[PDB]
Amino acid sequence: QAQAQNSQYALARTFATQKVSLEESVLSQVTTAIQTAQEKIVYAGNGTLSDDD
Amino acid sequence: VTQQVDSARTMVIGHTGAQIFNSITSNAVPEPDGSDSEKNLFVMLDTAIAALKTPVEGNNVEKEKAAAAIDKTNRGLKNSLNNVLTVRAELGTQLSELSTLDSLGS
Amino acid sequence: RASLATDLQGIRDQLMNLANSTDGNGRYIFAGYKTEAAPFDQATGGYHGGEKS
DSSP states (O other): OHHHHHHHHHHHHHHHHHHHHHHHHHHHHHHHHHHHHHHHHHHHTOTTOOTTO | OEEEOSSSOEEEOOOOHHHHHSOOOTTOOOOTTSSOOOOOHHHHHHHHHHHHTSOOTTOTTTHHHHHHHHHHHHHHHHHHHHHHHHHHHHHHHHHHHHHHHHHHHO | OHHHHHHHHHHHHHHHHHHTOOOTTSSOGGGTTOTTSOOBOTTTOOBOOOSOO
């Protein structure tokens, strides 16, 4: 029984690992996107751009 | 969604999207007028997008109005970045724990 | 500091997980003598185990 229980927990950890790793990847990309977004706002702060710009 | 991945340790195995893009950490920048801080990323992004596509040539009350919308967007983006970074950190701890626990199990 | 708080939160929960370890049959060696019982409070640290080694 004890060894079977260890097997159970091993399966659980496998699946949780996969899911959390994927989340990390996507969140990293999100962070870079938000960084560049913030950057663009800084540019928009310039008060000499014309309306086409 | 929670799951137990050991005899006692139980863990959050995925953060519902609202936590990521529709919340603020407990330390967000307050608005300078005290009204309330916008707290959805897309709401503020679309506010700014609408503001920029608005002609303001020589037309005060549109010039500064748009500028204020942009400022609010700036603050909002800052808070959003901090929130998502907090989520990243929590996941990093989760991964470190999982690595440590499995070795123990072996 | 809140990020570090979540970090310490994970580490603290890991400690609690270690403290509540089982024995080789599904009982708890970390209940001291009372292997028959669940030995710790996971909220704050209330210890429910035996009185003796």
